[PDB]
Amino acid sequence: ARKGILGTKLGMTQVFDESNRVVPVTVVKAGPNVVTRIRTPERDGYSAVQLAYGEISPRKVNKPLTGQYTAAGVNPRRYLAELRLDDSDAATEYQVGQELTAEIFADGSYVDVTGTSKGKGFAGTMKRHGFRGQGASHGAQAVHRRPGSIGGCATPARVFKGTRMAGRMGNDRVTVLNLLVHKVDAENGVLLIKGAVPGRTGGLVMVRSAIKR
Amino acid sequence: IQQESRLKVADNTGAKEILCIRVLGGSSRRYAGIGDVIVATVKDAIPGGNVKRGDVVKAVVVRTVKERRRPDGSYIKFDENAAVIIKPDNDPRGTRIFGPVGRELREKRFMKIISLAPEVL
Amino acid sequence: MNRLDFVDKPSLRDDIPAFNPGDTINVHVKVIEGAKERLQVFKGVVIRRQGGGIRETFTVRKESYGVGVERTFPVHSPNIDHIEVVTRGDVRRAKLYYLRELRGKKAKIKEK
Amino acid sequence: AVPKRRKSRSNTRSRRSQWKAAKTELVGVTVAGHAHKVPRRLLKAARLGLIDFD
Amino acid sequence: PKPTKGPRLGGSSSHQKAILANLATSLFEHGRITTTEPKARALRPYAEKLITHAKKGALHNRREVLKKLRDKDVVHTLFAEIGPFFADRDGGYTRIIKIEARKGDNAPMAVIELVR
RNA sequence: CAGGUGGUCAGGUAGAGCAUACCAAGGCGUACGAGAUAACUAUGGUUAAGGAACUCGGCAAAAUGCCCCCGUAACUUCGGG
RNA sequence: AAAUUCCUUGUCGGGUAAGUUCCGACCUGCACGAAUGGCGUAACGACUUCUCAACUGUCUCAACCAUAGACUCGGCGAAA
RNA sequence: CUCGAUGUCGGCUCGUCGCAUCCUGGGGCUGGAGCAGGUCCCAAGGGUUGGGCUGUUCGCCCAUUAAAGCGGCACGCGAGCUGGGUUUAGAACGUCGUGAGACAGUUCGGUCUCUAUCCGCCGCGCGCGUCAGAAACUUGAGGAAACCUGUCCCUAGUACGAGAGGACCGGGACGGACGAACCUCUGGUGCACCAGUUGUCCCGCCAGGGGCACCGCUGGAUAGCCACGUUCGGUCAGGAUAACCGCUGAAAGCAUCUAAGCGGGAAACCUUCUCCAAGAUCAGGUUUCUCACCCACUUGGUGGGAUAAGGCCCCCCGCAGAACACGGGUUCAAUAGGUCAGACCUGGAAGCUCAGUAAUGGGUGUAGGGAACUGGUGCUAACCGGCCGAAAACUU
Ligand SMILES: [Mg+2]
Ligand SMILES: [Mg+2]
Ligand SMILES: [Mg+2]
Ligand SMILES: [Mg+2]
Ligand SMILES: [Mg+2]
Ligand SMILES: [Mg+2]
Ligand SMILES: [Mg+2]
Ligand SMILES: [Mg+2]
Ligand SMILES: [Mg+2]
Ligand SMILES: [Mg+2]
Ligand SMILES: [Mg+2]
Ligand SMILES: [Mg+2]
Ligand SMILES: [Mg+2]
Ligand SMILES: [Mg+2]
Ligand SMILES: [Mg+2]
Ligand SMILES: [Mg+2]
Ligand SMILES: [Mg+2]
Ligand SMILES: [Mg+2]
Ligand SMILES: [Mg+2]
Ligand SMILES: [Mg+2]
Ligand SMILES: [Mg+2]
Ligand SMILES: [Mg+2]
Ligand SMILES: [Mg+2]
Ligand SMILES: [Mg+2]
Ligand SMILES: [Mg+2]
Ligand SMILES: [Mg+2]
Ligand SMILES: [Mg+2]
Numbered sequence A: 001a002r003k004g005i006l007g008t009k010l011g012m013t014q015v016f017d018e019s020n021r022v023v024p025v026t027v028v029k030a031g032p033n034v035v036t037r038i039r040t041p042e043r044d045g046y047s048a049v050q051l052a053y054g055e056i057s058p059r060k061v062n063k064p065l066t067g068q069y070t071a072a073g074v075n076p077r078r079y080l081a082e083l084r085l086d087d088s089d090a091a092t093e094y095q096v097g098q099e100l101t102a103e104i105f106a107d108g109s110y111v112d113v114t115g116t117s118k119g120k121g122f123a124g125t126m127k128r129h130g131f132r133g134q135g136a137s138h139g140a141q142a143v144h145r146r147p148g149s150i151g152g153c154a155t156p157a158r159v160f161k162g163t164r165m166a167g168r169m170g171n172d173r174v175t176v177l178n179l180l181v182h183k184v185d186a187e188n189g190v191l192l193i194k195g196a197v198p199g200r201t202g203g204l205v206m207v208r209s210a211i212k213r
Numbered sequence B: 001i002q003q004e005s006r007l008k009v010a011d012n013t014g015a016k017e018i019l020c021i022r023v024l025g026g027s028s029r030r031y032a033g034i035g036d037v038i039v040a041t042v043k044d045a046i047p048g049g050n051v052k053r054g055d056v057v058k059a060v061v062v063r064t065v066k067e068r069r070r071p072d073g074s075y076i077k078f079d080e081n082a083a084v085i086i087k088p089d090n091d092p093r094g095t096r097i098f099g100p101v102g103r104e105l106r107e108k109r110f111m112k113i114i115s116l117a118p119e120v121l
Numbered sequence C: 001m002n003r004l005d006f007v008d009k010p011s012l013r014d015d016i017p018a019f020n021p022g023d024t025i026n027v028h029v030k031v032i033e034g035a036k037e038r039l040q041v042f043k044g045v046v047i048r049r050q051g052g053g054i055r056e057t058f059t060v061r062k063e064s065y066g067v068g069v070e071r072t073f074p075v076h077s078p079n080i081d082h083i084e085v086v087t088r089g090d091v092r093r094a095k096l097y098y099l100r101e102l103r104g105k106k107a108k109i110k111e112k
Numbered sequence D: 001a002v003p004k005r006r007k008s009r010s011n012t013r014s015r016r017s018q019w020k021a022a023k024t025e026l027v028g029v030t031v032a033g034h035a036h037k038v039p040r041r042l043l044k045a046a047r048l049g050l051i052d053f054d
Numbered sequence E: 001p002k003p004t005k006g007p008r009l010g011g012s013s014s015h016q017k018a019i020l021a022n023l024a025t026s027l028f029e030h031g032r033i034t035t036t037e038p039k040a041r042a043l044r045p046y047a048e049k050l051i052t053h054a055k056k057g058a059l060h061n062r063r064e065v066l067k068k069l070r071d072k073d074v075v076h077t078l079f080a081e082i083g084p085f086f087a088d089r090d091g092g093y094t095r096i097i098k099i100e101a102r103k104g105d106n107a108p109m110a111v112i113e114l115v116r
Numbered sequence F: 001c002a003g004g005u006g007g008u009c010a011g012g013u014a015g016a017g018c019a020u021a022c023c024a025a026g027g028c029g030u031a032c033g034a035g036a037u038a039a040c041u042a043u044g045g046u047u048a049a050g051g052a053a054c055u056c057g058g059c060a061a062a063a064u065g066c067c068c069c070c071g072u073a074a075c076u077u078c079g080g081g
Numbered sequence G: 001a002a003a004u005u006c007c008u009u010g011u012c013g014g015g016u017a018a019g020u021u022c023c024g025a026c027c028u029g030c031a032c033g034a035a036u037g038g039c040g041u042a043a044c045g046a047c048u049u050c051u052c053a054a055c056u057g058u059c060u061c062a063a064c065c066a067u068a069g070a071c072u073c074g075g076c077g078a079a080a
Numbered sequence H: 001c002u003c004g005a006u007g008u009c010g011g012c013u014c015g016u017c018g019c020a021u022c023c024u025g026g027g028g029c030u031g032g033a034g035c036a037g038g039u040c041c042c043a044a045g046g047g048u049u050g051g052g053c054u055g056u057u058c059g060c061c062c063a064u065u066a067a068a069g070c071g072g073c074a075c076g077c078g079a080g081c082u083g084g085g086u087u088u089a090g091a092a093c094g095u096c097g098u099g100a101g102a103c104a105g106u107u108c109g110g111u112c113u114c115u116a117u118c119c120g121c122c123g124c125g126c127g128c129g130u131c132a133g134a135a136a137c138u139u140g141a142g143g144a145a146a147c148c149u150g151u152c153c154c155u156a157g158u159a160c161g162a163g164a165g166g167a168c169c170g171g172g173a174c175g176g177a178c179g180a181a182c183c184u185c186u187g188g189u190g191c192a193c194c195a196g197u198u199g200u201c202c203c204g205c206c207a208g209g210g211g212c213a214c215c216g217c218u219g220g221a222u223a224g225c226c227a228c229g230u231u232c233g234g235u236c237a238g239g240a241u242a243a244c245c246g247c248u249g250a251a252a253g254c255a256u257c258u259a260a261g262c263g264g265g266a267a268a269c270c271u272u273c274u275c276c277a278a279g280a281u282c283a284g285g286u287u288u289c290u291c292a293c294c295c296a297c298u299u300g301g302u303g304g305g306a307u308a309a310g311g312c313c314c315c316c317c318g319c320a321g322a323a324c325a326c327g328g329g330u331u332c333a334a335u336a337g338g339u340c341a342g343a344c345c346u347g348g349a350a351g352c353u354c355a356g357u358a359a360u361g362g363g364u365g366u367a368g369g370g371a372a373c374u375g376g377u378g379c380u381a382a383c384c385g386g387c388c389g390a391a392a393a394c395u396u
């Protein structure tokens, strides 16, 4: 009974609730979605539904993708993603060409928001893993942000797999759990979600009903 | 407020300045705000007063230089860090409070201090 | 203009008098003292207006009992009953932070 | 840190062959009737006559 | 305009300020300048803002331009010919044309010129 | 070749000054460059609240700093301090 | 109980919330002692040692900025 | 074994493993009334504090905590750091020696080198393969990360207990530590922002400004990056079990948890939540597009050439970024710049005028200046283009 929608992160603001408390909200433009495809067990081995979101010029879509959209008889969109349902497909509640909007959620509900975190570039150990570094005085020689030891000795004469080191950081797929939907605005089709949502403003975001609630 | 911080005593026990020894409320707790309980030592007192220098006491923070958020989105910030020496039952050992105090004492259940204070903000 | 202006518009409050840093202000705030909802008044000098519309805040400073106090409220906060302007000040800057280390007679502000 | 032993011919050559120049793609342009070949990023300069073909 | 992201031209920011002023003076004086491509790209908006001041063409704008340029003859021609020439054009007063890189350091080069 | 090398001359404004800052006369831009917001290193700068809790140790940094007028302890070899 | 004391962090007192260091004594001086000087001593010390005020990125606990490198392109072009 | 050198204590930084378990979890017995214990068995998922003294390890102590575990890894870790002790040359005390000197006695001082070749590890690309060439969406074989805990309240002053004292089990609220994302708020920073101001020099002079002095200094400060900030998390539910507790039940007419069989049973293990993932060479699945030529030859599952779908380079850019890659755009264009208008930051421009002997003040005027955010605008540059790139059969 999972519900899902694709949207765009519009940014953060603040609002006040009935108890006169400030609520930091992230505004998500859960735009209108089209389905374009259903994954059935008998045909693919699992249950899911595709979702198409985002206005795009037909000139910018190549022939294969255009043919895929033509088969389902919908106009091409920018993004395309699948909402993985449970094994109980029920082969219904989703017809090809159906439109989804933001009213599939309600005030006071809980959602799961997944996105792509902002890129951080090549990052050192202190930033990437919270290493303590070394001292800034008392004789320390050029090791103020260096990791220090990375192993033992002749036993063992190697470095183990998965040791924390410096490298590229960010641009990961991240999901945040149990975000309260403060309010859904039906006219402009946005969701006011309390808290922080991964990624940058304008990034694609998928909103799903929380499994744990 | 953390360990080694010094605070001004806001009551009439005779102590002037105390030094924070431990922030109670859990192992390795770092900062004590308004409404938090402190183990402290008396670094200065009025001569021939009730409390002497070097006594280990228990106190509650009532004023902080660092501004503190409130659930409605407002903040409060004082010009000094001040505490009140209390008894094991959370009653102040002194008889009156000097200066204003923060409203978080209400939710921390320090009603006696709240009543004794000249002003609650 | 901002992208979230349509979101923030219904929550913008009216009846906010125009005031600037340096002015003297009465702020009537709601207080939950049990289940009573009385109205406490904070009287002091505005020292800051960090802009932003629905997220704009301001800070007021006073001296209660030998101790200086600062309160930072969001403009448009429903917890503020009303704002009342007492006097207008004459200052040269926008942040008035220097008042944080002046006491007594040196801390006053001109009255125009 | 110094090399422990000299590299073999194969190991040296595998790395050494990766030091090479990338070739620039050229387009066609005619100036004063004479036809030349220039990198595309200099097409505007070639048309306006700021390119010395030598 | 938008500040340089990354290290400033010619060493420091004060040197970059001087470099931009000198390049703008030379561009207004000659109508056409050949330099390194990063310098031309940095110069473009800086020069267009001065041309906008000259288009406005008041005493206040002249003082604003003099805050940056030190060549009074160049200021005069900027306020007497350049601004009047571009009175009817809204933005886009310059143009960058990429040319062959120079020997010695293979630095990419370009010319920047007033549109006419 | 960022080291070393005796003597002479030595302007202005501010300043006690041959210190220091900006200039004159006179010299020079000194010999790889052009780019680019990686980590990390170096040299500088700023930092909420706390204030030596750091550490072998206040190492390093921060702080004090000028002129004029008051005032100045124990001790002392009577000069000082 | 020392630039001398092994036992030893000797015992008592002060200082600290907590003092193997410090200061004052005790004398059980392993192994002090009178020109290889004994005991003091105002002034002096880039000497050793303990405490305090002030101050601070030393630290809680890190964050940001500029520059020189590191990184890319062209030229020259080593070493263990 | 190492003398043609294997760097020696303590500390920092980074860890990893064992269980002989310190806390949290589950039990048996008890000289276990209850609260609390003792002892033994199972259990290694997570957690296991900050200071004073000492070169210290160790140890004593202070204040907390649910707890302040014990060990291996060259007594882990100096081509990662330090150099307080030890272990050179200086000097002194005690003691020993006639002396030179000596002392696992003491004391003060005392150079820590190296551009990473290989393996290993952390990241990122290029090629090829996956039997035509491509594009989009995917399954999950198998891995990785995470796993903490307190206080208060109801039950209930109930059970128990002479009283004192004081429950099990269930049901709520608020915390501490840790981690992730994010920038609305608070707070920090801010080198092409605004304002004040000192010295000096310059713009012919006044006025107005500019260069240098750490960004000269000082007061602020949008964007971005951030934590001291905001939000969220570690849950619930199944399965098989450890210790342990059983049902049925003979051998052995009784008994017996067991030899047949069937149950309960923990933070341990497997599913469940998050992330990676078909180089998973067993190289997967669902789809959609092109689906086409010409030349030579020893006619070859042969060499070439030209293309389709598609892609790349070039070009304008990015909150994507070391290069590379990734994302967006390229006139049917709002991509960057300019420009106009907002938002916001600063705080009342210049010129003119009035007042004042003057320093200065008032008016014109929420002024002027201005970056990052938002919207309009087709003015500048995104061009008049190059390189890649599609199939022998055969068996049932
Ligand atoms: Mg640090
Ligand atoms: Mg060192
Ligand atoms: Mg060094
Ligand atoms: Mg250093
Ligand atoms: Mg090995
Ligand atoms: Mg404002
Ligand atoms: Mg910047
Ligand atoms: Mg300068
Ligand atoms: Mg020389
Ligand atoms: Mg000499
Ligand atoms: Mg002179
Ligand atoms: Mg000099
Ligand atoms: Mg000079
Ligand atoms: Mg350079
Ligand atoms: Mg680079
Ligand atoms: Mg600070
Ligand atoms: Mg401060
Ligand atoms: Mg101190
Ligand atoms: Mg210490
Ligand atoms: Mg320590
Ligand atoms: Mg020093
Ligand atoms: Mg200094
Ligand atoms: Mg003795
Ligand atoms: Mg002796
Ligand atoms: Mg002793
Ligand atoms: Mg000490
Ligand atoms: Mg003594």
Ligand SMILES: [Mg+2]
Binding pocket: none
């Ligand atoms: Mg004699």
Ligand SMILES: [Mg+2]
Binding pocket: none
């Ligand atoms: Mg002797």
Ligand SMILES: [Mg+2]
Binding pocket: G037
């Ligand atoms: Mg003698």
Ligand SMILES: [Mg+2]
Binding pocket: none
């Ligand atoms: Mg002597």
Ligand SMILES: [Mg+2]
Binding pocket: G039
């Ligand atoms: Mg003596």
Ligand SMILES: [Mg+2]
Binding pocket: none
């Ligand atoms: Mg001397």
Ligand SMILES: [Mg+2]
Binding pocket: G045, G047
């Ligand atoms: Mg000396």
Ligand SMILES: [Mg+2]
Binding pocket: none
């Ligand atoms: Mg001694």
Ligand SMILES: [Mg+2]
Binding pocket: none
């Ligand atoms: Mg090179």
Ligand SMILES: [Mg+2]
Binding pocket: H002, H003
């Ligand atoms: Mg040997």
Ligand SMILES: [Mg+2]
Binding pocket: H003
């Ligand atoms: Mg030998």
Ligand SMILES: [Mg+2]
Binding pocket: none
């Ligand atoms: Mg050898």
Ligand SMILES: [Mg+2]
Binding pocket: none
């Ligand atoms: Mg270990």
Ligand SMILES: [Mg+2]
Binding pocket: none
């Ligand atoms: Mg065991």
Ligand SMILES: [Mg+2]
Binding pocket: none
């Ligand atoms: Mg009993």
Ligand SMILES: [Mg+2]
Binding pocket: none
């Ligand atoms: Mg037991």
